Every structure is written in C-alpha cells, then in structure tokens.
Write an enzyme that holds these catalytic residues in place. Structure first.
Site, PDB file in Angstrom:
ATOM      1  CG  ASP A 275       0.713   2.049   5.936  1.00 19.34           C
ATOM      2  OD1 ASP A 275       1.899   2.446   6.116  1.00 19.34           O
ATOM      3  OD2 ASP A 275      -0.246   2.230   6.784  1.00 19.34           O
TER       4      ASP A 275
ATOM      5  CB  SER B  18      12.420  -7.481   5.557  1.00 18.48           C
ATOM      6  OG  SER B  18      12.358  -8.803   6.071  1.00 18.48           O
ATOM      7  CB  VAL B  19       9.847  -5.250   1.185  1.00 15.93           C
ATOM      8  CG1 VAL B  19       9.334  -5.309  -0.274  1.00 15.93           C
ATOM      9  CG2 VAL B  19       8.699  -4.788   2.137  1.00 15.93           C
TER      10      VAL B  19
ATOM     11  CE  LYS C  87       4.826  -6.007   5.792  1.00 20.41           C
ATOM     12  NZ  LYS C  87       3.772  -5.249   6.354  1.00 20.41           N
TER      13      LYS C  87
ATOM     14  CB  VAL D 153      13.259  -3.530  -1.602  1.00 21.33           C
ATOM     15  CG1 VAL D 153      12.249  -2.398  -1.400  1.00 21.33           C
ATOM     16  CG2 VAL D 153      13.586  -3.734  -3.051  1.00 21.33           C
ATOM     17  N   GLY D 154      13.840  -3.364   1.540  1.00 25.22           N
ATOM     18  CA  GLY D 154      13.099  -2.833   2.679  1.00 25.22           C
ATOM     19  C   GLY D 154      13.180  -3.661   3.945  1.00 25.22           C
ATOM     20  CB  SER D 155      14.814  -4.007   6.693  1.00 23.83           C
ATOM     21  OG  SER D 155      14.924  -5.406   6.466  1.00 23.83           O
TER      22      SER D 155
HETATM   23  C1  LIG Z   1      -4.526   1.372   3.778  1.00 30.09           C
HETATM   24  C2  LIG Z   1      -3.912   0.553   2.668  1.00 30.09           C
HETATM   25  C3  LIG Z   1      -3.261   1.597   1.788  1.00 30.09           C
HETATM   26  C4  LIG Z   1      -4.853  -0.176   1.732  1.00 30.09           C
HETATM   27  C5  LIG Z   1      -2.982  -0.443   3.337  1.00 30.09           C
HETATM   28  C6  LIG Z   1      -2.856  -0.902   4.636  1.00 30.09           C
HETATM   29  C7  LIG Z   1      -1.819  -1.831   4.872  1.00 30.09           C
HETATM   30  C8  LIG Z   1      -1.549  -2.497   6.224  1.00 30.09           C
HETATM   31  O1  LIG Z   1      -2.397  -3.148   6.695  1.00 30.09           O
HETATM   32  N1  LIG Z   1      -0.468  -2.456   7.032  1.00 30.09           N
HETATM   33  C9  LIG Z   1      -0.586  -3.034   8.434  1.00 30.09           C
HETATM   34  C10 LIG Z   1      -0.151  -2.086   9.578  1.00 30.09           C
HETATM   35  S1  LIG Z   1       1.465  -1.719   9.218  1.00 30.09           S
HETATM   36  O2  LIG Z   1       2.518  -2.857   8.527  1.00 30.09           O
HETATM   37  O3  LIG Z   1       2.179  -0.399  10.045  1.00 30.09           O
HETATM   38  C11 LIG Z   1       1.260  -0.882   7.707  1.00 30.09           C
HETATM   39  C12 LIG Z   1       0.841  -1.911   6.630  1.00 30.09           C
HETATM   40  C13 LIG Z   1      -1.081  -2.148   3.711  1.00 30.09           C
HETATM   41  N2  LIG Z   1      -0.026  -2.991   3.641  1.00 30.09           N
HETATM   42  C14 LIG Z   1       0.948  -2.906   2.712  1.00 30.09           C
HETATM   43  O4  LIG Z   1       0.879  -1.909   1.861  1.00 30.09           O
HETATM   44  N3  LIG Z   1       1.924  -3.779   2.631  1.00 30.09           N
HETATM   45  C15 LIG Z   1       3.055  -3.733   1.843  1.00 30.09           C
HETATM   46  C16 LIG Z   1       3.881  -2.613   1.935  1.00 30.09           C
HETATM   47  C17 LIG Z   1       5.041  -2.533   1.115  1.00 30.09           C
HETATM   48  C18 LIG Z   1       5.366  -3.599   0.272  1.00 30.09           C
HETATM   49  C19 LIG Z   1       4.509  -4.742   0.142  1.00 30.09           C
HETATM   50  C20 LIG Z   1       4.860  -5.769  -0.748  1.00 30.09           C
HETATM   51  C21 LIG Z   1       4.093  -6.934  -0.893  1.00 30.09           C
HETATM   52  C22 LIG Z   1       2.945  -6.993  -0.093  1.00 30.09           C
HETATM   53  C23 LIG Z   1       2.594  -5.971   0.806  1.00 30.09           C
HETATM   54  C24 LIG Z   1       3.389  -4.815   0.944  1.00 30.09           C
HETATM   55  S2  LIG Z   1      -1.716  -1.137   2.421  1.00 30.09           S
END
Ligand SMILES: CC(C)(C)c1cc(C(=O)N2CCS(=O)(=O)CC2)c(NC(=O)Nc2cccc3ccccc23)s1
Ligand SMILES: CCCCCCCCO[C@@H]1O[C@H](CO)[C@@H](O)[C@H](O)[C@H]1O
EC number: 2.7.11.24
Length: 332
Positions: A161, A30-31, A46, A26-28
């Site tokens: 995020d 990677s997800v 992820k 879905v994502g890279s």
């Molecule tokens: C501020 C808020 C909205 C609560 C978040 C911060 C981070 C974060 O620490 N980083 C660290 C810094 S960073 O990676 O640039 C941004 C993200 C999230 N991570 C996150 O949303 N992960 C995931 C994104 C997409 C799919 C996922 C699927 C399963 C689990 C998590 C997922 S959500």
C-alpha cells in the site's frame, strides 16, 4: 549500531546505514530504490514523512510499523529492516522501513503485455492468497489496485500500500456506508481481474458520481433483497429513482474469456457485499485448479489491533513506535 551517512535526494534529507547504497528516488513518505550490500539485493526504503507531527500522524506511523512487522507471507509486503538515525527516544524523529525491491507494478505489466489466461490465473491467485492472509489478521486493504501490486520477472506478486484509486473502489466505500466488510477488497480484485482479462479499465470513472454510474450499468440497480438492508431512509429513496438498470450478462461482456473466469467475476462483482465470494472461497474456485494448494495458503498469527480504539498523546504513540523499532528482529 551501524554507522550512518547523509544524502540529498530531491530536496529531502536521507540518513541511512552504510549497508544501503545507490539510493535512487522512486516515489513521493518517500521511497528510494537502493542496493543492500549485506545480501547483495535491491531494496526499497521508505522514509516516513513527518511521523510525529499530529496525533493522527503519530498513530498512523505506529499503525504502519505494527502492520509491516506482522506481515509474514509470500504475497504480501514484508519488512527486511527498520531503522532510525536516532540514538535515543529524545533524538527520535524519523522512521525508515526496508523491503525487497520488486521492480514493477501490475499497471506496468498491463499496459504492454496482453496477459494469457494462465497469466490471469496466476496473478489473481496470488492476490487472493495474500488477501486470504491479510483478511485472516482482521485487516482490510481498502485500496487494492494495480499500482499497489508489485510483480517480478517470474510473475510473482506482493500486495502492498503506497498510500485513479476510485476505479477499483467498492461502491459502498464511495457512498460511505462505514461498516465495510473485508469483501470491499474482493470488489477490487474483480475490477483488477476484468482489466487483466480485457486489457481495459473496467470502470474508468471521470469522478465520483461517474464511477457509480459506470458500476450500476454493469451490475444493475440494487435488487429487492439489497434495498431491504439499507437502514438509512435517505440513501434508499434516491436509488429507485436512479434510472433502473438490468444487471448485464457478464458472459456477454467478457466475450472470449474462460467461462470459469467469467463465473468468478460474477461472484466478485456483486453489489451486495454480503453476497461476494471471500478470498478463501475464491481460492477453492475451479478457475484456479492449476494453482490452488489448500496446505499452502497460510493465515496470519493473531494480530493485536486494540491500539486502534485508543486516543493517546503524541509522545505516547512516539514512545510505542520507538519500542517496536528496538524490538525488531530481521527475517533469517
Ligand atoms: C494492508 C497491507 C497491504 C499489508 C499494508 C498496509 C500498509 C500501511 O500501513 N500504510 C499506512 C497508511 S498509508 O501510508 O496511506 C498506506 C500504507 C502498508 N505499507 C506499505 O506497503 N508501505 C510501503 C509502500 C511502498 C514501499 C515501501 C517500501 C519499504 C517499506 C514500506 C513500503 S502495506
Ligand atoms: C450506488 C450503488 C449502491 C451501493 C450498494 C452497496 C451495498 C453494499 O453491501 C452492503 O455492505 C454492508 C457492509 O458495509 C453490509 O452491512 C450490507 O449488509 C451489505 O448489503
């Protein structure tokens, strides 16, 4: 301990419990999307890339685990699971995080349905409600934008995020002010709301400087009260040379919009971050009279983020990330 199984997904190894099938990229990190047999629900998994390669990767990895373990709110991404193939701290080298799959982002929704005024209310309200909770843990999103907003078929939204971004960024971030209050996120919400209202990107900057030029054309050149708070001699001098610009009347700019939406936008898209509406204030704004419930906008438990000031060894961060994996308790 569950039993694992290995998969090849576009040049990446994925080693996940058997719980999780039908992995589809879905994502890279990677997800992958996957199907959770133990609930029957679709999930996003992820895999962190290279969690422990540098001190900064190590700390980031710990950072994301601690944040996600803490986030417990309907409009914010939450953790269903967290696992590693590792049988021990010595084995420990990948982290996987699991959440409920939402099947679209707000970009998708925006480019093929014109949202009604009721839609805009509901979507922006939920963004503010999640943001109220995030800000009450003394966290700043800093990159809120449509592609970071997962939406379901009932228009229910969660803030997340993934990690142009620039189109929704506060102009103080793009001038690296370095303080940043939480209202940088409120700037972003105003850009998102404008776009849900008009169907058009509010500030589609070509690059960094074009971004700032587009912003100043709507909101005008910094006023006396703002210029007065700028301690950097250099930042200042420049700006009064910068064309000068009337602040535009927003009622003129968002022509057929609900005048309450226009008023909310005026209060979010202010140059001076000290003067921008907060998420908790915005929730009480009359635009959201049909959705606001003051007894159902919860705030977060205290979040210990003292790790942020710490400069530790790779193995220390790694060991700490390992403790959090082990201590994880899934939701009901
Ligand atoms: C501020 C808020 C909205 C609560 C978040 C911060 C981070 C974060 O620490 N980083 C660290 C810094 S960073 O990676 O640039 C941004 C993200 C999230 N991570 C996150 O949303 N992960 C995931 C994104 C997409 C799919 C996922 C699927 C399963 C689990 C998590 C997922 S959500
Ligand atoms: C090129 C356009 C000029 C951008 C002006 C943005 C000013 C941002 O706003 C400032 O944010 C700081 C928090 O970071 C606060 O300390 C300041 O008091 C506040 O005025």
């Amino acid at each position: 301990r569950p039993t694992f199984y290995r998969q090849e997904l576009n040049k990446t190894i994925w080693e996940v419990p058997e719980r999780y099938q039908n992995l589809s990229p879905v994502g890279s990190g990677s997800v992958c999307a996957a199907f959770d047999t133990k609930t029957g629900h679709r999930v996003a998994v992820k895999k962190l890339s290279r969690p422990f390669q540098s001190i900064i990767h190590a700390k980031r990895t710990y950072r994301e685990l601690r944040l996600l373990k803490h986030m417990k709110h309907e409009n914010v991404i939450g953790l269903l699971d967290v696992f590693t193939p590792a049988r021990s701290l010595e084995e420990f080298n990948d982290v996987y995080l699991v959440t409920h799959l939402m099947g679209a982002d707000l970009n998708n929704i925006v480019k093929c349905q014109k949202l009604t005024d009721d839609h805009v209310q509901f979507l922006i309200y939920q963004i503010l409600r999640g943001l109220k909770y995030i800000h009450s843990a003394d966290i700043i999103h800093r990159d809120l934008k449509p592609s970071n907003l997962a939406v379901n078929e009932d228009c229910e939204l969660k803030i997340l995020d993934f990690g142009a971004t620039r189109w929704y960024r506060a102009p103080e971030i793009m001038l690296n002010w370095m303080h940043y209050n939480q209202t940088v996120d409120i700037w972003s919400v105003g850009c998102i709301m404008a776009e849900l209202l008009t169907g058009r990107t509010l500030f589609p900057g070509t690059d960094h400087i074009d971004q700032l030029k587009l912003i100043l054309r709507l909101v005008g050149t910094p006023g006396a009260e703002l210029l007065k708070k700028i301690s950097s001699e250099s930042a200042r001098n420049y700006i009064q040379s910068l064309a000068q610009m009337p602040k535009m009347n927003f009622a003129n700019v968002f022509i057929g919009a609900n005048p309450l939406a226009v008023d909310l936008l005026e209060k979010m898209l202010v140059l001076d971050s000290d003067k921008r509406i907060t998420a908790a204030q915005a929730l009480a704004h009359a635009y959201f009279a049909q959705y606001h419930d003051p007894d159902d906008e919860p705030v977060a438990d205290p979040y210990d983020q003292s790790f942020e000031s710490r400069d530790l060894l790779i193995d220390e961060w790694k060991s700490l990330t390992y403790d959090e994996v082990i201590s994880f308790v899934p939701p009901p």
